[PDB]
């Protein structure tokens, strides 16, 4: 007797939804959160002057062993010895 | 105790008979506890199938 | 699966950890074959580290018998008359060194599963629960709606 | 021995023979015995709680 | 027919021993057996979820059971326990109520005076002695 | 005095914190039920089948209790005296009955 | 600041007055004693105890078994001390730990019984109409410890 039209939560008549005490209370901690973000990145240390190149050399040295990284590559080396040890598939009794 | 194991077991899983009263009370107020005594549900031995279901006498 | 397959409590052989700890593990029998690659790390287990396996727990007794065979074998046998066989075929001496090591481990109860991953034999100390637990009592003992 | 109750290795015939004679030993009376609880008297699955008081 | 399949019947038996128990034709006919022997182990790898959640349901039905026999709730003894540092799980707290009613009913009259001591914190501000079972002890 | 708990069933609490304060100490010794509050056992002693004449025409009396009743009313039977339901007395097929454990595990 | 009586006046829960801290300190001083002395003189037998052990807490007593689901890196047969006891009762009495009983105070020993691996589990993932299915099979491993002997040392 109680029908929606078709997919209840789409369309142009839908299934109505309200808010319960659980989803105010939620939503209102998470704006406490929000806002103690906002006053903790009110006040910076550095004045966006003194931070001009506080990191260039740290961050110059990290892209050099970045490309370092990406140009020693190579074939891995190649011995003698597991050519040769592929031999004792047939050790018997010695 | 020390409870010789069959006596033990049958004074554990024993059945209670409780007796309710009715007289103004609201229905569904009598049903819950009824309910929760005749599923078993006030007993630390609680189980789905350890059929540890009670007698409620309501009057 | 579980409702597939059968299951089992945990328990000891014969109280084990209670008095002394023995070795649950009785004999192992290997068969090796003197030629044949798949008999290769049994054949350098048994040239380097079978005497020192034995010399380490002389509760067991080892035999290697030194048979053709396609598939080498090491069959476990337990104080409580369970006998396990393995496979070594094919397998590394660190591997075969692992699995008998793994074998004088373990006990000779059935590897299914253990249903409650604890045994005690005495549950309750102050007395297992009862429905009269908890409740008090009346004088004469008299029940609900009663006269005398 | 460990899981045993002890009237699994003894076995016992008359316990209540055995503990008078074990009072009378001990200078104890007498046990009478007292029904302690009960639930369900008249259904074919009772639960008594006898308990046995000395002095 | 250069190398046709000789052991197929390795095969079969080896999807079909996990069907035994199953009832109908899909304890011996592959073509069924395979699908519900999927099913059944799809089942199997999804359940263990659902165990721990159902186990702790149950503990937390007996706790609740145990904690009103005490005239508690649970919600009170959890939270109270929890306060005076005491950390027992839900498994162990049901373990205690059903093989330990002496342990249990200490620890039920011990969240009972936490929640009293708490509810006259409340009204008082400590002033003075803020509780006996208050103060929690500090670590390093 | 206060107590937390009332302390008449199954206990009497007292809840202690130590000197160093970093263990409780609870003490709990088990309350017995007094002699006040227990009620005699009963001692029937029904005797009513000794007629003047013979006294092993008792003894033949003794097994004269014996009943039979068909399915219907037996399972109404039954189930009026355990308080159950007519389902749990109608038997089951072999599949159910041989697809049963005879020897499961034990604990304790 | 006077109400007549009526259905919402007072409260409905009865009116709570916790004792005084000082008798109460002397209060408690006497029952650890007691308990002490108890412990001194041997009036308890059979008591069991609450362990963390590997992420878990068990609840032990003497005699009995313990499966662990890993590892140990110890021999069978080698005897170890389990610290972390957080409850230990006998008859009559329970010693509650914040969160955890002292060095001193309880002794849990646990010998190694068994190293073994679990039964397999299979670990199946399936979707439909997707050509989705994977299979494994894991044994973990298990370790099983005797527990031989919980102690208690008058230092309370
Ligand atoms: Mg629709």
Known sequence: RGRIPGRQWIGKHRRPRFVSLRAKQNMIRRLEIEAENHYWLSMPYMTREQERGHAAVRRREAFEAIKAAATSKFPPHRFIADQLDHLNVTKKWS | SSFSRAPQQWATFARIWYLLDGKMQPPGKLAAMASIRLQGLHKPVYHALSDCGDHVVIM | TARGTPSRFLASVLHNGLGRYVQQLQRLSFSVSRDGASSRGAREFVEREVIDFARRNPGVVIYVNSRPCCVPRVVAEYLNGAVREESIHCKSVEEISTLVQKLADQSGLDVIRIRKPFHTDNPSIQGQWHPFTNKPTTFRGLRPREVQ | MTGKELFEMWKIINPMGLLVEELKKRNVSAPESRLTRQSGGTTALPLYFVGLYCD | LRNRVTDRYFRIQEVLKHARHFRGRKNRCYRLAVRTVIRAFVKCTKARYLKKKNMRTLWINRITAASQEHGLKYPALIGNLVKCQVELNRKVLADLAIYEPKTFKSLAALASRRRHEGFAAALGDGKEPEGIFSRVVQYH | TYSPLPDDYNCNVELALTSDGRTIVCYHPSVDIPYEHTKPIPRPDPVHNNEETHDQVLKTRLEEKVEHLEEGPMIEQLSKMFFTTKHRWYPHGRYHRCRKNLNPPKDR | ?156
């Open chain 7, 1 to 156: 600041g006077y109400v007549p009586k009526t259905s919402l006046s007072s409260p409905p829960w009865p009116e709570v007055v916790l004792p005084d801290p000082v008798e109460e300190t002397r209060h408690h001083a006497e029952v650890v004693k007691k308990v002490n002395e108890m412990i001194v003189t041997g009036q308890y037998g059979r008591l069991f105890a609450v362990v963390h052990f590997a992420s878990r807490q068990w609840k032990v007593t003497s005699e009995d078994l313990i499966l662990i689901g890993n590892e140990l890196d110890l021999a069978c047969g080698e005897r170890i001390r389990l610290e972390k006891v957080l409850l230990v009762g006998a008859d009559n009495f329970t010693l509650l730990g914040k969160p955890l009983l002292g060095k001193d105070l309880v002794r849990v020993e646990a010998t190694v019984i068994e190293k073994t691996e679990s039964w397999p589990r299979i670990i199946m993932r399936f979707r439909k109409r997707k050509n989705f299915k994977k299979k494994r099979i894991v044994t973990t491993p298990q370790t099983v410890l005797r527990i031989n002997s919980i102690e208690i040392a008058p230092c309370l």
